[model samples]
Target: VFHKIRNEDLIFNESLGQGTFTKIFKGVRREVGDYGQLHETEVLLKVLDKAHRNYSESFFEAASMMSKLSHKHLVLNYGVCVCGDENILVQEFVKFGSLDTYLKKNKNCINILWKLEVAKQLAAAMHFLEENTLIHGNVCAKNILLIREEDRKTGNPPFIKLSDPGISITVLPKDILQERIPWVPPECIENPKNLNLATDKWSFGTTLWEICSGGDKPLSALDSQRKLQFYEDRHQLPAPKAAELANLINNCMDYEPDHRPSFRAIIRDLNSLF
Candidate 1:
């Protein structure tokens, strides 16, 4: 369970990022420590848009739902501060940034082994989602964050913390989804309301495409219109030269949805490759 703290308790600092629904700020708050002493901890505050007609109305509900989920790969959502339209979400901050930007910046540094570890961790996240009512409506490089643990070995992929798992309470606005068009599956593209558990697998496959190809944008060459048509036609993008990786991605993006492989099963298949 998460605590519902007040706005005055937090000290806002520099901006972390901004999204359609909210603007993220790096902030800190003092709380009672285990020894009953005041301790300051770093946090990310997500403030919903004040101008939006009804964006913050259900933000508290969303915070409640997000608090129930617990997974090593899933990003942490602390709680919400409700002050009329200024609803703010407190979350765990990952300093390393998203896989999308990291790959673009560190293209050559990430080898095949690093890619495999990322793929396996993401699959584990999707598999965990199956245990709850959540469906990761948006699973892409941008939402997959990385963090290097102090205890980790020197030569290993950074730990992955999946952010923005597309909880239904905050179904992405059209403007936001526009940027994530590449990750949309045929069913969702045809009808925006078609998200289901299988949809996560489709997005997971596209995410694998980005991971296996060293963080390239999904279907970058084609325009959004053609890309939607391509998926609807049951076409798949080829990436990851390895046969095993290719086979798993292909099955995941299968248009039938029913034919998509379970994220649980994809784990062992990825493990066998290394």
Candidate 2:
């Protein structure tokens, strides 16, 4: 379904970031025929980590799956570059990077309506995935990419594009717990593979909290694993100024999976906010 990008066509740039199994790079790809044959496009390249053991299975399988995702919010996997031992996945590069970074760098131009505008678009994308029976195991703010609108004077928030790299590592290695711990749901923390649509909703709640709080860390008060383990005992995320938004987040992150709203329901609630 996707093109096979040639090594000669790619000019690798600086590293974008690192994943457990891949190294993301900001790269350039030369394509045959745009206005002319030697046209260049900016692309995010996901290449295998040198330390990763399973080569062929990781790239091809993940690549094949990501290539098929057809949604506006999902970062589009354009193609793969397989040359010799190297296998690089190419995807659309959202200029503003992660929503977490964008929110953190904010200078207070966003209003509650703008915030809900961002959140609703995300819920719409999630609902699409839910309809397709896709579980975006990672649904945190960092996993969402953004693009600023074309007009500068409008003061619009960058649009969100859900950027899950096809396969999520269910078993979080203890070493990385400090990093990914915040996004883990109670049931999933208890059983790493116990993730479901409800778990995605719970993580979405954290992302929603990040949006409302203008990028503050969720559960920042709970420093120890002990406090996090008793998730129910922890107080709710500080409610947003908007009561409707606050209530929706509370409903989303309920400790019991059954208490969480489905993406369809979440979309309905969000649309009312606008």
Candidate 3:
């Protein structure tokens, strides 16, 4: 059940992160112990800005949608922190931060094999969302969470969990959206409301580019938005290291949204790559 938690129950610690409409804080939930003593359970509190008048409804709606989704690769929401009109969403705290910074820092050490594995894992997550007829709305490295495997010596890459899916566009400013233009599809830019599995596929291809290029920005050298869109409109893409991978990225970034492969098909191809 999604219950309202007390303000006193959550003790905010250091700032974990921030996004367009929210600030994340590492917090401890005070719970009564079995022996009648108080215990602290660590969690992540995603607090929406009360100043953003358009966000509360969407924030709660996103939280409700997230509560229904249960997958290994998707982050889990614990409950809502309701202090009058203010809303703070509580979720499981993954030790490692977002994939954007994490990948950038570990670029040199992350091998090709692990990059492919990460892509495969993300594909599986997206496949689940597609089957349920839900669009991630915003799919990017900044929304991906990393959790190291228990047995690192076993030669497996760290686990990833998709976060902050389905946030309303009303919460993001024009500048922030412009900064993310490279990853977004043409249809979405022309029609902000026109988001679907295909758009997600387009973003996923950009993510693949990031992983393949060791966290380099997709079309980073492009000087302007018009230039970036011109190439995307023409279906032009940066070259991938391997032919098979290049083919996959190109197909995903196709000018026509319908031409992009389904996540299921993408995963099958990714699996065969390694």
RMSD of each: 2.9, 3.0, 2.8
Tens-digit lDDT string for candidate 2 (138-200): 787777888664244776655778885444546445534434555667777667778787778
Query: What is the C-alpha lDDT profile of model 1 across 37-88, one tens digit per residue?
Result: 8978888787877776365545445345545787898888767677554678
Lowest-sum lDDT 10-residue window in model 1: 166-175
TM-score of each predicted structure versus truth: 0.86, 0.85, 0.87
- What does candidate 3's lDDT look like per residue over 1-274, in tens digits? 4767888899999997787678889999887768898778888898888787467677767557756888898888878888876678888888887788887888767776777777888898899989987777677787888876424688667689888653565355555556676677777766767767688898888777776775667766665676556755675666865434777887787778998999989988898887
- Error (Å) of candidate 2 at residue 244 is 5.8
- Separate clash counts for every candidate: 0, 0, 0
Best by lDDT: 3
- lDDT of all predictions: 0.73, 0.73, 0.76
lDDT of 3: 0.76
